Structures are given as C-alpha cells and as structure tokens.
C-alpha cells in the first residue's frame, strides 16, 4: 500500500544525468538538489560558483557549520573533485521528519563532475565507510542518519525512466521516482521481492551466477560475470560489463537482432539510431536476464530487462519526430555495474540491516503489450560462492 506517502515521488532526473533528491544543509536551511549515488560513500556539495550550478552551499552563512580543517579528494569512474571537510545539520524535506549532523565535503575544485542541465549541485554517497575518502573514519551520511535517529537501517529506490526523451523544462517538471528512506512502499512494485546477499559491505556488491540473452545461456565461467566485482549503482547510467563479458553479450545481442544491422558506433554506445515515430522494433531485441545468488543455499533468482531498459532514449540531433536511442550497455575494466537503466526496471531495496538487496518489478518500468520486465525464481544453482572473484 502507500506505506510512505511523504517520500513517494521525491526524485527527479534521468539515467543519463542522474536522479536527485531535495536536501537542506545548514541553519538557516539551504536547499540543494543532491544526486543519489549508491556507488560511493561521500556526501559532498558544490561550495563555490560554478558555470553548471545555479546554487551552492555557503558555509559562512550557516550558524551550525563546523570546520574539520581537513582536505579531501574523491575520484570516480568518470569525474572527480577536491574539497574541504566539515559537518552541519542536514534534512530531507520529502523524507523522514528528522535533522542530523553529518559530514559534508564542500567541493572547491572539480573536473567533469557536475553536469550542465542536470539540476543537481551535490552528491549523496549511500555506500559504506570502507570506500569513503579520505578514509573509513569519515562516517557516511546514512550511517549518521541511523545512529542519530530511529529510522530503520534500510532504504529503497524506484528510478523511473520516461521511455522517451525529456527536455530541460519537463525533466524539472516530471517526477523521476521515489527514494523511500527507512522502509519499503508496496505501491512502487508488483509481484514478489527477491533478495540477493550483499557479499561485502563497501560498495553494494552482489554476485551474478548466470546470464541469458533471450533464454540463451551466455555460458561463461560465472567468475567472469563478477570480475573483479559486481555492484548496484544508481549513479551509473549504463549496465557496464567486464570486457570479456561485454564482448560475448554484444555478440549474442547482435545475433538475436540480426534482422537489422547497426553501425559499430551504436554498439559502442557512442552513436544513436533512430526510427520513424512509434516504430521502434522492440520485438527484434532480446530480453536480458541476470541471475543473482539467492538467500537460500543453492538457490537463485533472476531479473529480466527489456530493450526498453537497455536502449536509452535521446533526442535526435535534428530534433525530429523520430524516436532515437543509444545502446546503454558498455565495457568496464572495474567489474560489473548495474546502473540506472537496469534499476529503472525494478524497485530495489537496500536492506543494510539484513545485509541483502532485494529486487521487484517496478510499477513504473517501461514496456510494451507483449513483454514486461521480470523477477522470478527460485532456481537450483550450485557453487554460487565460487562465482565471486577473489
């Protein structure tokens, strides 16, 4: 049901630029749009004028600001920033009714971090201390939140991809999803919730034990699927796979859709392809199933996405009436990354309390009249622990 109404629909944005929630820092409260990123553990915000920022954190205006006299540097797969550490009172307008003092990195320098038009000025690293900068002694935001309040050690995300391009004004006007803090709202999904164990508390790491393209087993040593790790990251657009897995999957995805030929630039995620209005040939593209280690011994389940998920909508160059997309699956040299496009198909529950991650068909996932995303199980699978890379 509508368990947490005050938090439903509190996100905005899209896979390409990121999903963000509204937050306030300081006294008096300073409103800022914060990118929700489960792929990192640092809470940082722009603290100085930037051509891509309409606003930013102003420490000298916060009576509750506290200087920690320490610098911090944080590099991501793509983009990085430098800033000064401190703490302050923080709140989430559309979230639990509480205020907590959290560590905040005031970004003073950055390169390829902020996105023009994204509308967010900071980032919320929801992962664990293990990968926090400068070190694990810097308590991550969610941790501070649980220690200081009675909010359950859990949060769930519902990222809603529109299924078509969204221009600046409409991205700002539309609801991009919900981030339920401290609970699970049943109106955000259908079917049952299946859980996969969080292998280790640093990134939100899971283990993929099998991969299928339209039912066909990619048939690779499952260790490849998790080389050198597999994480869930709302801050990554595409579904990224380690080189060898990417090469096999693309070869299989190309064979399944062979009735049409596409340029290499398309499969490299660099160039888009367009089709006459409403004629995208979805049925020629295969569904992709990722089996994940289950909670019960030798048991697994699978999540299945449609091309409506891995083909990312983008406005045509000549702003035509054509429906154009980009291949939202790309190579990776740092393991698998189940990004926004994968998440847009499901309601993902980060059960930190029970050290597990649950998936369920999203009530807002894009599909057609012939297929829908899915989460099914159980499946008898042996030696899944071995699928994990060491």
């Amino acid at each position: 049901r509508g368990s947490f109404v005050e938090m439903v629909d509190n996100l905005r944005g899209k896979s390409g630029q990121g999903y963000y929630v509204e937050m306030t820092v300081g006294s008096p409260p300073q409103t800022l749009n914060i990118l929700v990123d489960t792929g990192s553990s640092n809470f940082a915000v722009g603290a100085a004028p930037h051509p891509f920022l309409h606003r930013y954190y102003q420490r000298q205006l916060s009576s509750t600001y506290r200087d920690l006299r320490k610098g911090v540097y944080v590099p991501y797969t793509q983009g990085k920033w430098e800033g000064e550490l401190g703490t302050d009172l923080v709140s989430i307008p559309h979230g639990p009714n509480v205020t907590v003092r959290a560590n905040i990195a005031a970004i003073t320098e950055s390169d390829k971090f902020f996105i023009n038009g994204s509308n967010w000025e900071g980032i919320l690293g929801l992962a664990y201390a293990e990968i926090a900068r400068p070190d694990d002694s810097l308590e991550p935001f969610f941790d501070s939140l649980v220690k200081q309040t009675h909010v359950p050690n859990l949060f769930s995300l519902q990222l809603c991809g529109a299924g078509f391009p969204l221009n600046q004004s409409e991205v700002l006007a539309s609801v991009g999803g919900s981030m339920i803090i401290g609970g699970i709202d049943h109106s955000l999904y259908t079917g049952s919730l299946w859980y996969t164990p969080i292998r280790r508390e640093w990134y939100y790491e899971v283990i993929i034990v099998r991969v299928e393209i339209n039912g066909q087993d990619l048939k690779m040593d499952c260790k490849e699927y998790n080389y050198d790790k597999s994480i869930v990251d709302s801050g990554t657009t595409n579904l990224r796979l380690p080189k060898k897995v990417f090469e096999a999957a693309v070869k299989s995805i190309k064979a399944a859709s062979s009735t049409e030929k596409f340029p290499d630039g398309f499969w490299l995620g660099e160039q888009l392809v367009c089709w006459q209005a409403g004629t995208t040939p979805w049925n020629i593209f295969p569904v992709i199933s990722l089996y994940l280690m289950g909670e019960v011994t030798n048991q697994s389940f699978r999540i299945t996405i449609l091309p409506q998920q891995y083909l990312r909508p983008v406005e045509d160059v000549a702003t035509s009436q054509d429906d154009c997309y980009k291949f939202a699956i790309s190579q990776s040299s740092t393991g698998t990354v189940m990004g926004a496009v994968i998440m847009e198909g499901f309601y993902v529950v980060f059960d930190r309390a029970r050290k597990r991650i649950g998936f369920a068909v999203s009530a807002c996932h894009v599909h057609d009249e012939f297929r829908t995303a899915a989460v099914e199980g159980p499946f008898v699978t042996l030696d899944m622990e071995d699928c994990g890379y060491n």
């Binding site: 896979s15 990118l35 489960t38 553990s41 991501y76 793509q78 990554t236 657009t237």
Partner: peptide, 7 residues
C-alpha cells in the same frame, strides 16, 4: 551519461 567511486 554519468559514471559516478574508485577504490
């Protein structure tokens, strides 16, 4: 696109 941490 966004590709958010290196460890």
């Amino acid at each position: 696109e966004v590709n958010x941490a290196e460890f």
